Design a protein around this ligand. Structure first.
Ligand SMILES: N[C@@H](CCCC[NH3+])C(=O)O
Ligand SMILES: CC(C)[C@H](N)C(=O)O
Ligand SMILES: [Ca+2]
Ligand SMILES: [Ca+2]
Ligand SMILES: [Ca+2]
Ligand SMILES: [Ca+2]
Ligand SMILES: [Zn+2]
Length: 316
């Protein structure tokens, strides 16, 4: 809509209070004009028709429990925008400030969120397995990172290429968690998964086998479920990103950690410069080793730790 840039306030899924960029024209719209061609948040109103209606509010106050998922979808899209702009000099998901569109209240009891090729979609969950999935900054950053991947490497959402795709989304989901610096971790979806059970998560990068995901190439899933295990074989790359950042010893291979900034730079460079739609794990190692070499030189600790990390999860 055409209108005035303004600042509203509301509560997120977790009851946290935050300010949100709105646009005034009769109603206050969840439209942020401060970021590229803007960030727009829509109400799917418990239906599967997309995007639904641009989120509208009479008083610019978003404190109803109905409002909570919209507040987080809108705010965490902004933090994610800021991360790619400030840390990687990237303007929105397409590199040219494309409008970022989110719909919340998708379907009834929907225990998922997705990038549909055009926009992000968040369910409310059933209240048991999930609460509203926009509540997780790692979830919002994960789904918008699918958009980045689609406009860069274009990794095919199948087999090894699909697993790298899933891994990139978990890596950048987590680095956006750390950039926003609330209670960041190396787990995926802890904030919105199983509200009755504390301490658990959907997936773990630090120890993927905790949730039944392989942490070594030799334990890879080769069946057809989950498009050839895109959410499963992602553990092998997830664990490698974790060792590169934090270090550790895994099946007796020692890796010196180089921290989150360097991990980000290396994997962003691999994503935008070397990876292709059909890239496998082996070509991801080569891409990640070339990126560290470009950035830090062939003889650096940074290149050594990428090599030791890919060695540790059994990727030659
Ligand atoms: N995003 C993962 C986990 C979601 C929870 C399962 N309903 C997937 O779709 O496989
Ligand atoms: C839930 C979310 C992180 C994603 N759609 C899976 O994995
Ligand atoms: Ca209101
Ligand atoms: Ca957390
Ligand atoms: Ca997390
Ligand atoms: Ca839980
Ligand atoms: Zn994903």
């Amino acid at each position: 809509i055409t209108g005035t840039s303004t600042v509203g306030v509301g509560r997120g899924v977790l009851g946290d209070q935050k300010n949100i960029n709105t646009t005034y024209s009769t109603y206050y719209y969840l439209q942020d004009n401060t970021r590229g061609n803007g960030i727009f948040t829509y109400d799917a109103k418990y239906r599967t028709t997309l995007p639904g209606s641009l989120w509208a509010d009479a008083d610019n106050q978003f404190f109803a429990s109905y409002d909570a998922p919209a507040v987080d979808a809108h705010y965490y899209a902004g933090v994610t925008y800021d991360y790619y702009k400030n840390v990687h000099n990237r303007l929105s998901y397409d590199g040219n400030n494309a409008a970022i569109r989110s719909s919340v209240h998708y379907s009834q009891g929907y225990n998922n969120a997705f990038w549909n090729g055009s926009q992000m979609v968040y369910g409310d969950g059933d209240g048991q397995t999930f609460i509203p999935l926009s509540g997780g900054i790692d979830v919002v950053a994960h789904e918008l990172t699918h958009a980045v991947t689609d406009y860069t490497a274009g990794l095919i959402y199948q087999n090894e290429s699909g697993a790298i795709n899933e891994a990139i989304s978990d890596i950048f989901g987590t680095l956006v968690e750390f950039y926003a610096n609330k209670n960041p971790d190396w787990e995926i979806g802890e904030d919105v998964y199983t509200p009755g059970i504390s301490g658990d998560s959907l997936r773990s990068m630090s120890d993927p086998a905790k949730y039944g995901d392989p942490d070594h190439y030799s334990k890879r899933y080769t069946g057809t479920q989950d498009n050839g295990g895109v959410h499963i074989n992602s553990g092998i790359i997830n664990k490698a990103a974790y060792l590169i950042s934090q270090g550790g010893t895994h099946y007796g291979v020692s890796v010196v950690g180089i921290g989150r900034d360097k991990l980000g730079k290396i994997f962003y460079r691999a994503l935008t410069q070397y990876l292709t739609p059909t890239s496998n794990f082996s070509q991801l190692r080569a891409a990640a080793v070339q990126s560290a070499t470009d950035l830090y030189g062939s003889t650096s600790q940074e290149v050594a730790s990428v090599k030791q990390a890919f060695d540790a999860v059994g990727v030659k």
